[PDB]
Amino acid sequence: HWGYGKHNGPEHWHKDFPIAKGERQSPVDIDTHTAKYDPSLKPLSVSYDQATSLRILNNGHAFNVEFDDSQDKAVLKGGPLDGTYRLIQFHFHWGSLDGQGSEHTVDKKKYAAELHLVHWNTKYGDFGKAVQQPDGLAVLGIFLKVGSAKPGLQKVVDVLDSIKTKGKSADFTNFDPRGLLPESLDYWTYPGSLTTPPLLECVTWIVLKEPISVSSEQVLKFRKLNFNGEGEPEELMVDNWRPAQPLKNRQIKASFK
Ligand SMILES: [Zn+2]
Q1: Contact 56/156 with Cβ under 8 angstroms?
Q2: Ligand 1 center to residue 92 CA distance, Å?
Q3: How far is CA 235 from its chain centroid?
Q4: Class of the CATH domain delimited by 1-257
Q5: 182 phi/psi in degrees, rounded to 5
């Protein structure tokens, strides 16, 4: 039932998901002047050479590229994390307008879009057990700005016409998520939550400082997707982002001096 519209959108999620007013909700604004360098953060390790994408799907809120997480084929390690986190899916949030779209902000600056690579902690049995624990998920967040085209994104963009509406899916093999990374993996990290219902506070957030650059042509294809199912009145899939939430007692740690 929840969405991003006037009445089912983020400002009303708390009616059905009371955790929405919890102590470590995401996203948050990253105040660069308050986020301290932490020299105990170990280097961020990403092992994606054996990543096995399976399918792409429009679930009515975003589109998800799903991966085989049955073994350590595509794992995140290091940084603030203890243990091994398996990539399960990635998706985007974007705006109707280049000036908005990102979930996290940096000194209140909004980016045009935000990519989330979602991983879960093999400490737990599976995704379902991991989401129920404060140390269960690690989400790598990567800002998008409008500029030159992102070649590693073109394979995703080139299949969006086949998943225009909610419920549609398609096979989507051999996608290399490495092609979505920026040059620097300098990042900020803090403990937080899912940014969509059920909004569980199970996420170690790792937000990269350097955005990737995508083309107008590429984001205009994002904005052509539909929230609605085929045959229902069109609602364009745009502004599917949750705004910054209160930071409360939390500190953002920076990985760079
Ligand atoms: Zn997300």
Answers
A1: yes
A2: 6
A3: 22
A4: alpha beta
A5: -85, 175
